[PDB]
Amino acid sequence: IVGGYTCGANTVPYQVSLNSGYHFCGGSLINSQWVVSAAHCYKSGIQVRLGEDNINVVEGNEQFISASKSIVHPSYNSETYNNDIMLIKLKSAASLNSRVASISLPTSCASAGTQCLISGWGNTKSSGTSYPDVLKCLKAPILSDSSCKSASSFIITSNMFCAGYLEGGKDACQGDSGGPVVCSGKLQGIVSWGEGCAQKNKPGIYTKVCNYVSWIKQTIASN
Numbered sequence: 001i002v003g004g005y006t007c008g009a010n011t012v013p014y015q016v017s018l019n020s021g022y023h024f025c026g027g028s029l030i031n032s033q034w035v036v037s038a039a040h041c042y043k044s045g046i047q048v049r050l051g052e053d054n055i056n057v058v059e060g061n062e063q064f065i066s067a068s069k070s071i072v073h074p075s076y077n078s079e080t081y082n083n084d085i086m087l088i089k090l091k092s093a094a095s096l097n098s099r100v101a102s103i104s105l106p107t108s109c110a111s112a113g114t115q116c117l118i119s120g121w122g123n124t125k126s127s128g129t130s131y132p133d134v135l136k137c138l139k140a141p142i143l144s145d146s147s148c149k150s151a152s153s154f155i156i157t158s159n160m161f162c163a164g165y166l167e168g169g170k171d172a173c174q175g176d177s178g179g180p181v182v183c184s185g186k187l188q189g190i191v192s193w194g195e196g197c198a199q200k201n202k203p204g205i206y207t208k209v210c211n212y213v214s215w216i217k218q219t220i221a222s223n
């Protein structure tokens with residue numbers, strides 16, 4: 001997250017860290033046994049880390065649980081990032097508490113202008129590199145699709161939306177991948193892509209979760 005702020009320990013209790021020997025992606029806890037992340041975060045041997053603030057210190061509220069199954073969206077396309085969503089089932093159910101909590105799926109899509117919260121442990125600089133140890137947060141509005149589309153030479157599909165700032169300075173970044181965009185208590189977005197970070201005319205592109213609720217519910221019911 002570039003241009004955000006320190007969230008505060010466990011103030012984003014659905015935020016998870018995906019770890020394969022080191023943090024590599026974010027994700028969102030949607031019930032005690034399931035996490036939503038990005039398909040581009042797919043990796044063999046994922047451990048889900050719940051209740052994290054400082055990802056380099058055991059602070060006392062963590063649950064580490066190995067994935068039993070990863071399910072990348074059937075139609076994920078790695079060249080366009082269309083359908084950039086993945087479900088991860090935990091080997092055992094997380095113990096839900098005030099610091100480890102699930103976030104609701106949306107029932108309707110969110111409208112441009114709505115305020116959302118984006119969070120993660122990704123790069124905090126638009127140029128250069130600094131990876132934070134504690135969770136960072138950014139309040140950011142959903143943008144018009146048209147402006148979203150003008151901002152890129154790459155395809156923006158109906159499964160994507162833009163959120164953030166065209167004037168730069170505030171954005172998600174590498175390492176935030178797979179993490180939540182939560183708007184009015186609903187998981188509306190997943191950190192997907194963007195050209196650099198926090199650059200002028202290159203806001204963030206997010207997977208449009210409201211399009212996937214039937215898939216998420218059916219998959220969870222059958223697995």
Ligand SMILES: N=C(N)NCCC[C@@H](NS(=O)(=O)Cc1ccccc1)C(=O)NCC(=O)NCc1ccc(C(=N)N)cc1
Binds near residue numbers: 081173
């Ligand atoms: N097919 C498309 N759409 N290609 C455009 C996006 C590719 C890539 N963008 S990028 O970070 O590497 C920027 C870039 C690098 C070299 C040359 C030009 C631009 C990218 O975003 N790849 C996936 C990735 O890196 N995701 C992590 C991520 C998370 C958040 C942001 C953000 N700014 N909000 C960006 C990237």
Ligand SMILES: [Ca+2]
Binds near residue numbers: 053055056058059062
């Ligand atoms: Ca920790």
